[PDB]
Amino acid sequence: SMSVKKPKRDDSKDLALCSMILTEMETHEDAWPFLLPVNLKLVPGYKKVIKKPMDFSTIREKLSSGQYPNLETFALDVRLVFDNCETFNEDDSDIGRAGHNMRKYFEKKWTDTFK
Numbered sequence: 001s002m003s004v005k006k007p008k009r010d011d012s013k014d015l016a017l018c019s020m021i022l023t024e025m026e027t028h029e030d031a032w033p034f035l036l037p038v039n040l041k042l043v044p045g046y047k048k049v050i051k052k053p054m055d056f057s058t059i060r061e062k063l064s065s066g067q068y069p070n071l072e073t074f075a076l077d078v079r080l081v082f083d084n085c086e087t088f089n090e091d092d093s094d095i096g097r098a099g100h101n102m103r104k105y106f107e108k109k110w111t112d113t114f115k
C-alpha cells in the first residue's frame, strides 16, 4: 500500500533469462511448427478459430523491442503458442505432439530459472 514497499524481487536479469529460454525453444528439434506465424491464408479455419495467433518469431520480436512489460507477459505469450496448438491440432498429430513436448520443455525451464 502507500509507502509500504513489499521487498523487491530482483528482475534485472529477466530479459536475458527469457531470451536464453526462448533461444532454447527456438533451437529445440520440435520447434518447427512454432517458428513462424501460422499462414492464415493457407490454413483453413485458423483465422476464425484462433483468436490470438502467436509464434516464436513474434515473441522474439516483442522481446527484442520492449513489448513485454514483465516476465509473466512473456510466459503468457509462450503458453498461448501451445494453447493455440492444442485447440487446433489433434494430440497425436505431429504438430499436436510437438506442442505438448515444447510446453513441457518450456515449463521446466520456467520453473528452474524463476521458481
Ligand SMILES: Cc1nnc(-c2cnn(C)c2N)n1CCCn1ccnc1
Pocket: 032, 033, 034, 038, 039, 043, 084, 085, 088, 089, 095
Ligand atoms: C503451430 C501450428 N498449428 N497448426 C499449424 C498448421 C499449419 N498448417 N497446418 C496444416 C497446421 N495444422 N501450425 C503451424 C505449422 C507450420 N508448419 C508446417 C510445416 N512446417 C511448419
